[PDB]
Amino acid sequence: NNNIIKFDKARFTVLTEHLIRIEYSETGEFEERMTQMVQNREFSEVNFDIIEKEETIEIITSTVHLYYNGGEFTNASLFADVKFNFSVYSNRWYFGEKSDGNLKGTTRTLDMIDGECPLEDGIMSKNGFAVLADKGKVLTEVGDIAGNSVSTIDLYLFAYGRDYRQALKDFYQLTGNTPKLPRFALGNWWSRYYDYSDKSYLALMDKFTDKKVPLSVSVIDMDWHKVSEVPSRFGSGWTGYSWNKKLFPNPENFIDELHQRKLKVTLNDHPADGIRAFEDPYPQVAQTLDLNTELEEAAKFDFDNLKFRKAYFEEVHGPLEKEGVDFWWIDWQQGAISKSGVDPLWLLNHYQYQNAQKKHKNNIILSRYAGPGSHRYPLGFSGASVISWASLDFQPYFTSTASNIGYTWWSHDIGGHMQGYKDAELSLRWLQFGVFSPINRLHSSKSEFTSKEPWHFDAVIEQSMIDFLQLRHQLIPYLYSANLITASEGRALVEPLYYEYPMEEEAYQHRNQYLFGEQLMVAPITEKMNSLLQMGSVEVWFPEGTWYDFFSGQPYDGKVSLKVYREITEMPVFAKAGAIIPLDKNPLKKEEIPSEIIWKIFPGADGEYLLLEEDNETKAEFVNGIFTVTSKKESSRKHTIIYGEHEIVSAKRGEFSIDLNGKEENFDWNFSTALFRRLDIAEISYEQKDEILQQLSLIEEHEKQVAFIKTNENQELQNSLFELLYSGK
Amino acid sequence: SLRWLQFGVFSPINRLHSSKSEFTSKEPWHFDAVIEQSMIDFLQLRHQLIPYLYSANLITASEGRALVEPLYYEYPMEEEAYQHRNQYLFGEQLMVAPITEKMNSLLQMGSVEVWFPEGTWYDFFSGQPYDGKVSLKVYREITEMPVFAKAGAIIPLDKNPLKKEEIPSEIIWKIFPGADGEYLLLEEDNETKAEFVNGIFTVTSKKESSRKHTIIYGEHEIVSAKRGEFSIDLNGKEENFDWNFSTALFRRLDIAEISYEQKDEILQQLSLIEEHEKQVAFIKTNENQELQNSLFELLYSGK
Amino acid sequence: IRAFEDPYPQVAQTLDLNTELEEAAKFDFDNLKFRKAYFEEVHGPLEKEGVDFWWIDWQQGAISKSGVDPLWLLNHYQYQNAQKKHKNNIILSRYAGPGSHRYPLGFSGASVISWASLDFQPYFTSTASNIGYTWWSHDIGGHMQGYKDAELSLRWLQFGVFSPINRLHSSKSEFTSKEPWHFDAVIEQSMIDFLQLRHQLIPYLYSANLITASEGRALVEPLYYEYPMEEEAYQHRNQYLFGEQLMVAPITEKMNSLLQMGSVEVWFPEGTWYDFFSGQPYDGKVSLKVYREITEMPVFAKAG
Ligand SMILES: OC[C@H]1O[C@H](O[C@@H]2[C@@H](O)[C@H](O)[C@@H](CO)O[C@@H]2O)[C@H](O)[C@@H](O)[C@@H]1O
């Protein structure tokens, strides 16, 4: 190709104006095969310039000068200057050196992590460049490990500046797009490390129904299999493939009962101890792999081995799938060691994700992160987080930052996994985040005390958790449409603020704030409430524009950074003027696609929303106060329209237009009501409540209302009253 | 010592006195060059105020009105007039809020919560404006005292406070723009009326004299050393004082014992952000609570 | 030298650069032709306009094809090149390893403005004599970040006046000027007094400079050079000899507000010592905490 240049023992491939592959080969042969990371090097032709001399070469694109002075790659022989001025002297890449600016990516797991842990670099940098080293093995055409690359150094130089979304799109072109999730993945999951019986598990599922909590997935953790019943001469019961018959005397009947309740079923698989001689599938595996059964030779875990993988999928997973298991929870914690040098977690995720496609369309796994490109094998499973405010306070940042290495379907244990401390408010705040996260999977440790059941908690916490869990199912249309946009267009559901606002310094200073799809901006509260206010808080950056609280309609004039206060039952979620958000009107109703959609419209600007579905596309347009709904294909679906406050149209069938110009634009939210509520719940002196209510009611000029609150001895009460005055300005 | 002298100068009598200690002299030159110069400035101000004080003295004797009044004499139905114990009226033209607490070393400024009655008020010294009615924490360096005059205030000052003479040969008429006003200067052997009506300033006296009048309208000396009775039209003259938000902001940030990164960010953000409500939202995020109140005073004056 | 620069056309011609692709003359001090073009065609025109010597401000790492630190190549070649236009010329540049004392002056760079930075700096300065690097120029008052305190600025200037080089410098902040009249009348007058003292000391400094060059004796010595067998000469990190006639104990801690004085523990060697400024006497040998107002610095001279 014209986009390929060889010089000395190096090869340079200009894939885009902003993406260059850099290779070294001692043998003069360069690698064309796919790798664990890279699935596609076919990119459209681009323009660039070369200065080639006897001893040096310079490649020049719109954004980078790449220099190579010959010989082995060193920090002196191979380096690049970006054509940007984001920094004063951090604009140069040197081979093998780190530079400042990397916005980070993700890491394997949150196992044993209490609050923050270090992350790996991503492809995004504030200074406009990043290098992604390909250190993986080569694949065969069908996707088996083929061995070592002939490109003994193989690098990707990203020089996208702050065009983060295009960097991610081209990353997906190189490493392959995320597959589409199935709709069931986007609902509530129930999970608990608890030794349920068939009877007590179904009783709990029927209790969820009675309690008005919708579920899409039934996880069965490791007590599904033999544990204490495993003879100690075999080792532990951690790995198992044999039903505990006391708890599950008829597995297929139990899974049929979950299927009748419209639940998808997954089992915990700890693969590391393989198939030992006590297991129900051992006789078939032993025959297939020619094991010495009289010496009880184990089929040790070996995912490098084709015969082992075949026996694992066909003779170990196969019978369980025949009993009705829908997909696999791969729960690997036993290290990165294999004869091939390929991480066993990568081999599991790559091969299990492929195998899952045989029994179901668009199937998933649930497994830990296995390095760049492992977004091809959703879903991510972050694992055994410590239950703490610190862990919750890290998790939104962790989740949005992961989009910087394209790993956009993290499923966290909602409420935290293990250890840590009880606080029903922490559980409630964690569920609020989970509902506005990629995946909402409730899960917990082997403790008698860590159940995430809403009715574990008092009546106030229970009702709020049920409300948020119902909200998750109202959001499934929005989530599923965003899912198809991840798969087809390479856009993350969860974006850091700096994707949309790359030149705003405040977009780098609100770590836990994120865009959730294209219509909603989320600022979860991740700190214990101030008991004097009976409210939690978070500093929100409002971009330019008019913003509304998604729930209350409280308005905010951007651009501003403003501390916002919410009771423990309320979450800061915001929509711009013109936002249109579809909601399922019947989130409890078991139906493959919603029979009724609520179109929730935020007044004050034009907008539009495209609802992508399995078998349809529905466009909602809001232009000069006219709201129109059209679909590719006709259906019996009934549309409800909510314009700000008021339901305008109920259950209208087919395509239509309606003029909202003559309809009430304003939400109910008002300063006086909100003020009374904040003063009333506050654990402060009644004389202070009386004086604040009286003075803020009497003083007419906004600047003097602000001067009055500025004299308050309670600094946080000042900030709370200021938020109300700012919204009421 | 310096704050106590500031109060004394705006008290009924300014008598420096001290104990038998070798260490308690009230001589200004007992102190360092900064304190000395400020004490000399305030002590000269006391003599500039003698015409105002002597006129108020004759008003105590003849009309039973105190020189120093609690706020509630003028504002009996305002609850805030009972909540500012150290704030007072000083004659009829000036309202005083002495600073009586050691400065905040992070700000290099002392402070007092001032109640501003209804009306437009000016700092007597700087011309910094304040829209009443409001209660507002005000910040001053140790060399500066919170003293305020309403729009229309007229304050006579002795132009020659060091000059040994039984009555001033020269009076400065210090006029605060924005309203009508008047001042009656009672003396041993004269009465002089200063009137400010629809922007016309008039001076008349019961008896004629050689006295020379100076007129200062806000910022600017309009008339120097003019003899006898006269009128002058100030409608076409600059009403506005120099005091400006940007200069005052730079000065407060510059003396503050805070991080230079904080100074840089506050100066940059308050210069860039155009909408007053967003300037206030920006300072509301500051981790230094007293710095918030100081920046808020400047924003309130600059609104 | 990139394609927008005023000297680029001449450099491009000298180094055979591709001007239509705007090929930069990338920094390469391993390259004889680059160095020649840098000195003759980049620095040369600026020297012709009257620039006397070069402040080499290098912060971009230690990488080169040769394995020689670019900072060493800059200091070695620039110091040599500076001798062409002026006798006994200098540079101003960071330390480039043992032997780089051949290329004065040392430039310590972007210190944080803090009491902690000032408290390190006398020790830093005297200890440098142990690898023969005796002409450190510190940013007097600190370079960047940190916190405002006019007393820190005044104490830092006191040290600077009794340091190898007295260069006032500061960051891009509107708030960090080292102008004496930035501060109140007391600080301003003290800074002016110390700045005048620096010029009173130039004969003493210049004589010590010729003694460094001809006899290998540092201007600033740790106490243990003169008193190697006295344990106390190893226990006063910020105390030093300044030439042969003066012993300096800078105050590097914020004053005690109850005393309105700063302090430092001074080790007085055997002998009769006088405060250089006041004549206050001290009988050695003794370790004694000494107190000074913020306008006064502990500097001592022996009888004789
Ligand atoms: O399948 C049970 C459980 O396994 C993993 O978590 C374990 C955790 O619960 C246990 O306390 C620790 C202590 O050794 O080991 C594992 O981390 C898995 O992460 C979890 O989701 C499962 O529920």
Ligand SMILES: OC[C@H]1O[C@H](O[C@@H]2[C@@H](O)[C@H](O)[C@@H](CO)O[C@@H]2O)[C@H](O)[C@@H](O)[C@@H]1O
């Ligand atoms: O020439 C300007 C300046 O450069 C150097 O110091 C810089 C410093 O002021 C800046 O804040 C930081 C932040 O990136 O970079 C450099 O350290 C040099 O050391 C200094 O003397 C100069 O004044």
